Nucleic acid binder design. Structure first.
Ligand SMILES: [K+]
Ligand SMILES: [K+]
Ligand SMILES: [K+]
Ligand SMILES: [K+]
Ligand SMILES: [K+]
Ligand SMILES: [K+]
Ligand SMILES: [K+]
Ligand SMILES: [Mg+2]
Ligand SMILES: [Mg+2]
Ligand SMILES: [Mg+2]
Ligand SMILES: [Mg+2]
Ligand SMILES: [Mg+2]
Ligand SMILES: [Mg+2]
Ligand SMILES: [Mg+2]
Ligand SMILES: [Mg+2]
Ligand SMILES: [Mg+2]
Ligand SMILES: [Mg+2]
Ligand SMILES: [Mg+2]
Ligand SMILES: [Mg+2]
Ligand SMILES: [Mg+2]
Ligand SMILES: [Mg+2]
Ligand SMILES: [Mg+2]
Ligand SMILES: [Zn+2]
Lengths: 137, 61, 100, 65, 139, 178, 208, 71, 101, 50
RNA sequence: UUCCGUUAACGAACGAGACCUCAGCCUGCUAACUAGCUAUGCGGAGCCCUCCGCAGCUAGCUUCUUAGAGGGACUAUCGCCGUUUAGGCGACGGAAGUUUGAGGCAAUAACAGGUCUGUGAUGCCCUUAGAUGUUCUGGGCCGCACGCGCGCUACACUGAUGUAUUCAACGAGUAUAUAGCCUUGGCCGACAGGCCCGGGUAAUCUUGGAAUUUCAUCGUGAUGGGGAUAGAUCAUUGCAAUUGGUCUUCAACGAGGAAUGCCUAGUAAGCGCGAGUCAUCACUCGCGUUGACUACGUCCCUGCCCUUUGUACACACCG
């Protein structure tokens, strides 16, 4: 009778919701989409020309799954392996200004809001949109 | 190609103890009892293949 | 010749993976085709993008030859410098250096 | 040094069409090693197959017939 | 019928809470059919694919898994669902059905009803690994 | 029956054309045949315990080499699934049968040690066959266009002319000369 | 304020400092440990000595009470410090340790001094005793010489509560002599003699 | 290995020597009698003693042995 | 009125357990509800150090390890009766802290 | 006199017991060298368990 | 040298065992607002049902986490073997049939083994005032044509690279001076980094805690494996330059001769995390994750132990 974010797998969900943001045509884009690397440990910036919308869909699902995460939390979850050459590999974070910016746009779309608990929370309209797009799968 | 069933194990023998000397009887002729050696792990009641059925052996090799 | 433009321009000095990426996508050039397909109508565009970084909105830090001794852009032996004369990095060369 | 072709002519274009029903196995690696073509062009040929549908899909291998 | 069953493997525990209904199966609030990786998915459909859906067609299952690794969590749920389905009949239906499903599960694999006790032992000093030591250079 | 390999392969068709290697291979369709070759069971505890282990488990566990591949049984069983699909789709038969035929045609019979020649244990026979097949696939896969599944499939069918059969040939030649 | 971990470490190192300070001042009296307790508004620190009539001198005890109050910045009228007599001089390891040190320093032969200490510990009622003296006694070469008797366990958990050990470095005329004294304690269920628990190898039987 | 320390051998011999009247064949009865007829600190030492006593009752129920006396 | 929390910190299990049972039973004497005792997770301090004063010889490290045990008691009562109950004697090794809860 | 900034480093921290400038343990504010600290481990309360 | 027995020995001391710590099982008990489970009530979306969050000073409970008292295993039963002992092998059961695993402690006798540069432990010799200490300034230990020793990173397609699922434990964390520690959150900054709101002297706050896994560009080329080495550049730490960001540079390296080291089960091997080191900079000690091949035998080599035997050795065959 209804398929919900739980009922549909994350991969096809995030790709469909990235397409949803693609033809939505409301949220803005920065001037540095291709040039900037999403993380300093990364060498090649994301080869996908529309990487920004895929990333924004990843945020749209993440805030639905868990709430109260700040800029540092998203900087942490998008980290990974940093190989320092002949030195042993280690952990590294991701970019912060781009995450701050995309979160600010998502606030401008009303999908999220600031909280007294620290971080962000999903607004009812945004999770409603996620619910019906899950139902359209 | 005379398949033989291991009938008794005579303890590990050899320089390193890698070979294990056993007594076998043929499935085609049960009454014939020979002595041979086998590498690897062998337990009683097993069935073992061979190529030459005329080679003999010695006790506690 | 046959390598993708993503890394075909790695061969020419002064340009690696990063600048190749910054040029193949700032001229609105197709990315999923090899260099052998590329013809003259886009070679001029590629050279225009490469030779004019700052005028093409290259982020200012991206340029490699930054603020020469005085313009952002893409002698040590004579001045008697420890860097020109010399390992300059200050390495424990007790063990290494066995190449000659 | 195996110098496989980077661009395919109409020759390979129709040989692959002819042999794809009769090939009990078609894979990018076998196609590349047999028809003297690059693995990327083997991928493109298998997408042309899916366009024509003369027959799994995985990030590393493709098994179809 | 509401029972608690804990499935433990290494350092992963899957807590299953039973409730009567229409046989809905959910893990961590997500469907059992969306077990990732999908290729180890058949490892967690063993009780359903062996006992059969007719056994659990009238009681749902909701499991939450914590700790361990991915494979450890998969084994934890693998044994937790089994324990919960034994408790299905042991406390709420009868003895014979529970006994026979337990025997069938045991004859399929011992781990389904017995928790494997293998744990990581502490690492000893004077060496790299827990049991391995350094390279000995006499001169 | 109700138990099939990946819900796809039926075990109740595969036999062994020998009465010396029956119990060491878990291919009988009454027990010891599983859904997939990944299980967290202990088989090194007691002697001859690995005989009860499924053959597919042995094949998928012997591929985690070299040192850059161990601890990655997931890739091992995925590759075995890929090569299994290749074998079944090409040969139009039960891939279990091809696996059993390759193992039963890739086991050496006699060696020579101490130098005197003498026979080989059946458990050591199947173990050596599996090790030889995995090492041959690794040799054919290193620095080549081929992926793991393709060379594994080719070596499996060719052993049912091949690396493993030639290794067994030279081992038996060394054995039979002493 | 101060976290629990830092406070616990501070009291541990403070007790060690107190032990070291008191053991290097009561050489004429045989310092034999200290008991420290924290009652509401009071910090009691009772010193032990084999000879107590000389610790009192009780003004000197009040000076040593002010010692911890003002050296460690402790609050006034919250710290108390008195002296106490040993229950058993012989059964105490350090007591006989510095007793042997004093005996050898006075001019007695070391052998006779350890025989006397060895007789005294059995006078106390020890299960067994061991005295080890290492260093140069008369010759340039150093030697290790031991006198042991009675029950003398050497391994296991019971070694750290069924024995009492003491080690000292007596500065002699020609160098430093190392002395070690080990005393086994019997099972006293009350606990006044030694441990309150029996040995694993000691089993008692009720007659039928 | 599974061989018994002289302490447990000795104590089993003594408890059977002085308390053969009531002590029975089951291991758990043997240990629940041992815990109050004698003072054993280690619980697993007590278990070893009880099992050993059970084994010697198995030995003696067929005939006399060389260990115990009285009557 | 004016709930009171008492914290019992020590290193020895036996002393803490006996004094906790004693204090809880004393609180029960005055017919007072007590939520507990709550056994706070024990905290372990681990330190490793080289035995050899000079690095000569094979490297052997000893591993000192200390345990810190804690209990917490909440009593819904006036603080004065809490002070009366805790005013009784104590055993060595146990530290008592009182706070308004 | 002591003009060099001794706000940190081994020139400012010494073992509380002995006074060495090397082997200083600092975990939990012990502030002592390994030899002296191992000497008084029983005194501090540091006892071996395994 | 654990025991049974044999017995010119009898009766005893150490060592071993016994002991202690941790893990492994408990739907049994103790009891949890600085920890949780369920139902309900409210609000969120598609009455019910799927479903996320918030309360209910008791909705109920401790099955799930914590920590305590306890229990559980003792080889007892089965068969065989052995002597009818000591015990061993294979069985059912059980969480466990190896004293269950892993450790701590660990006898006598020595080494001219190491440490005087850890010690207001110390004897002798030496400096004791153009001081061999003391205080600061600067350098040096970091040298390099060269030999060796322990580890890090690779030789790639089982992979690199780029998207998108996401599962741990150990421990540690403030002087409040605006604020020295852990840092949450907001803002700015491509990244490195900076400002503001603040919490935690702690199960409360940090703590909401990677290889692997769908998808694709590579395509067998010393190539996008590899990044040695260089230059330009920004900022952090530090009183004073160490490290970390960006781009450019892209060396040897295509499984390694004689020799050689570790390891038998959640072990090896692979991947990270914490702590020590610390004004700044990670090898050692622990933690967890994925997870196997073979062996379960032997004294062939390298040793160790015991008995007999030979000796011209006793600094003891390097005699
Ligand atoms: K990430
Ligand atoms: K050099
Ligand atoms: K030191
Ligand atoms: K509701
Ligand atoms: K010294
Ligand atoms: K000196
Ligand atoms: K490079
Ligand atoms: Mg370049
Ligand atoms: Mg003993
Ligand atoms: Mg012991
Ligand atoms: Mg519970
Ligand atoms: Mg027990
Ligand atoms: Mg010497
Ligand atoms: Mg000094
Ligand atoms: Mg000096
Ligand atoms: Mg240097
Ligand atoms: Mg080392
Ligand atoms: Mg990847
Ligand atoms: Mg996790
Ligand atoms: Mg490369
Ligand atoms: Mg490179
Ligand atoms: Mg170091
Ligand atoms: Zn010191």
């Amino acid at each position: 009778t209804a398929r919900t974010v739980k009922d549909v797998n994350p991969h096809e969900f995030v790709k469909a919701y990235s397409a949803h943001l693609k033809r939505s045509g409301k949220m803005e884009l920065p001037e540095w989409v291709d040039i900037v690397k999403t993380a300093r440990f990364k060498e090649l910036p994301p080869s996908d020309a529309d990487w920004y919308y895929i990333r924004a869909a990843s945020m749209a699902r993440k805030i639905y799954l868990r709430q109260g995460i700040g800029i540092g939390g998203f900087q942490k979850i998008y980290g990974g392996r940093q190989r320092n050459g002949s030195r042993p590999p280690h952990f590294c974070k991701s970019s912060g200004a781009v995450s701050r910016n995309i979160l600010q746009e998502l606030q401008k779309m009303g999908i999220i809001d600031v909280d007294p608990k620290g971080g962000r929370l999903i607004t009812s309209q945004g999770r409603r949109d996620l619910d019906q797009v899950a139902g359209t799968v | 190609v005379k398949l033989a069933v291991v009938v008794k194990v005579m303890g590990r023998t050899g320089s390193r103890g890698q070979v294990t000397q056993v007594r076998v009887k043929f499935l085609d002729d049960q009454n014939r009892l020979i002595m041979r050696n086998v590498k690897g792990p062998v337990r009683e009641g097993d069935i073992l293949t061979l190529l030459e059925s005329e080679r003999e052996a010695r006790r506690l090799r | 010749g046959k390598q993708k433009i993503m890394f075909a321009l790695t061969s020419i000095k002064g340009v690696g993976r990063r600048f190749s990426n910054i040029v193949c996508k700032k001229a609105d050039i197709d990315m999923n085709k090899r260099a052998g397909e590329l013809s003259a109508e886009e070679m001029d565009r590629l050279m225009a993008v490469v030779h004019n970084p700052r005028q093409f909105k290259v982020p200012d830090w991206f340029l490699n030859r930054k603020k020469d001794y005085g313009r952002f852009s893409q002698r040590l032996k004579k001045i008697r410098n420890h860097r020109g004369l010399r390992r300059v990095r200050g390495q424990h060369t007790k063990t290494t250096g066995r190449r000659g | 040094k195996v110098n496989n072709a980077v661009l395919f002519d109409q020759a390979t274009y129709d040989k692959l069409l002819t042999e794809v029903p009769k090939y009990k196995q078609i894979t990018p690696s076998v196609l590349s090693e047999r028809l003297r073509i690059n693995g990327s062009l083997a991928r493109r040929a298998i997408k042309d197959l899916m366009e024509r549908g003369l027959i799994s899909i995985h990030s590393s291998q493709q098994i179809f017939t | 019928g509401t029972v608690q069953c804990f499935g433990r493997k290494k350092t992963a525990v899957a807590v299953a809470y039973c409730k009567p209904g229409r046989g809905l199966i959910k893990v961590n609030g997500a469907p059992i059919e969306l077990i990732r990786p999908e290729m180890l998915r058949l490892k967690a459909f063993e009780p359903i694919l062996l006992a059969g859906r007719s056994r659990f067609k009238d009681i749902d299952m909701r499991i939450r898994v914590r700790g361990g690794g991915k494979t450890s969590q998969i084994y934890s749920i693998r044994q937790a669902i089994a324990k919960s389905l034994v408790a299905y009949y042991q406390k709420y239906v009868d003895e014979a059905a529970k006994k026979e499903v337990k025997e069938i599960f045991a004859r399929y694999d011992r781990t389904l009803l017995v928790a494997d006790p293998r744990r990581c032992e502490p690492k000893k000093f004077g060496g790299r690994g827990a049991r391995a030591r350094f390279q000995k250079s006499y001169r | 029956g109700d138990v099939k390999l990946f819900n796809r392969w039926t075990f109740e068709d595969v036999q062994v054309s020998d009465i010396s290697l029956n119990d060491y291979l878990a291919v009988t369709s009454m027990k010891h045949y599983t859904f997939l070759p990944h299980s967290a069971g202990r088989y090194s505890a007691k002697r001859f315990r690995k005989a009860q282990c499924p053959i597919i488990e042995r094949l998928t566990n012997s591929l985690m080499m070299h040192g850059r591949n161990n601890g990655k049984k997931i890739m091992a069983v995925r590759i075995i699934k890929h090569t299994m699909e290749i074998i079944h789709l090409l040969t139009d038969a039960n891939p279990i049968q091809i696996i059993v035929d390759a193992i039963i045609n890739s086991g050496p019979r006699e060696d020579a040690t101490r130098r005197q020649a003498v026979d080989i244990s059946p458990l050591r026979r199947v173990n050596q066959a599996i090790y030889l097949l995995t090492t041959g696939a690794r040799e054919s896969a290193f620095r080549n266009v081929k992926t793991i599944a393709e060379c594994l499939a080719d070596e499996l069918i060719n052993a049912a002319n091949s690396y493993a059969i030639k290794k067994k040939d030279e081992i038996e030649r060394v054995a039979k000369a002493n | 304020q101060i976290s629990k971990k830092k406070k616990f470490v501070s009291d541990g190192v403070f007790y060690a400092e107190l032990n070291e300070m008191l053991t290097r001042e009561l050489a004429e009296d045989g310092y034999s440990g200290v008991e420290v307790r924290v009652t509401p508004m009071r910090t009691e620190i009772i010193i032990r000595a084999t000879r107590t009539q000389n610790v009192l001198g009780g003004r000197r005890i009040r000076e040593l009470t002010s010692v911890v109050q003002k050296r460690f910045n402790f609050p006034e009228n919250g710290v108390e410090l008195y002296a106490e007599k040993v229950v058993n001089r012989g059964l105490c390891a350090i007591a006989q340790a510095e007793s042997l040190r004093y005996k050898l320093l006075g001019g007695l032969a070391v052998r006779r001094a350890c025989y006397g200490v060895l007789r005294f510990v059995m006078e106390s009622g020890a299960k067994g005793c061991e005295v080890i003296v290492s260093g140069k006694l008369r010759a340039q070469r150093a030697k290790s010489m031991k006198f042991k008797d009675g029950y003398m366990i050497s391994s296991g958990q019971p070694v750290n509560e069924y024995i009492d050990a003491a080690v000292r470095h007596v500065l002699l005329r020609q160098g430093v002599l190392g002395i070690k004294v080990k005393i086994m304690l019997d099972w006293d269920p009350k606990g006044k003699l030694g441990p309150t628990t029996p040995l694993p190898d000691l089993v008692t039987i009720h007659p039928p | 290995g599974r061989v018994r320390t002289k302490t447990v051998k000795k104590t089993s011999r003594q408890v059977i020597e002085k308390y053969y009247s009531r002590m029975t064949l089951d291991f758990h009865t043997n240990k629940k009698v041992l815990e109050e007829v004698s003072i054993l600190q280690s619980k697993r030492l007590r278990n070893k003693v009880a099992g050993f006593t059970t084994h010697l009752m198995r030995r003696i129920q067929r005939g006399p042995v060389r260990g115990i006396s009285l009557k | 009125q004016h709930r009171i929390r008492i914290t019992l910190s020590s290193k020895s299990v036996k002393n803490l357990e006996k004094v906790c049972s004693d204090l809880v039973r004393g609180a029960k004497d005055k017919l007072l509800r007590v939520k507990g005792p709550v056994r706070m997770p024990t905290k372990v301090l681990n330190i490793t150090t080289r035995k050899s004063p000079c690095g000569e010889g094979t490297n052997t490290w000893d591993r000192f390890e200390m345990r810190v045990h804690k209990r917490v008691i909440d009593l819904v009562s006036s603080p004065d009766v809490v002070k009366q109950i805790t005013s009784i004697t104590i055993e060595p090794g146990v530290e008592v802290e009182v706070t308004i809860s | 006199w002591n003009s060099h900034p001794k706000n940190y480093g081994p020139g400012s921290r010494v073992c509380r017991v002995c006074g060495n400038s090397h082997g200083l343990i600092r975990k939990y504010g012990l502030m002592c060298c390994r030899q002296c600290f191992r000497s008084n481990a029983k005194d501090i309360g540091f006892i071996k368990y395994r």
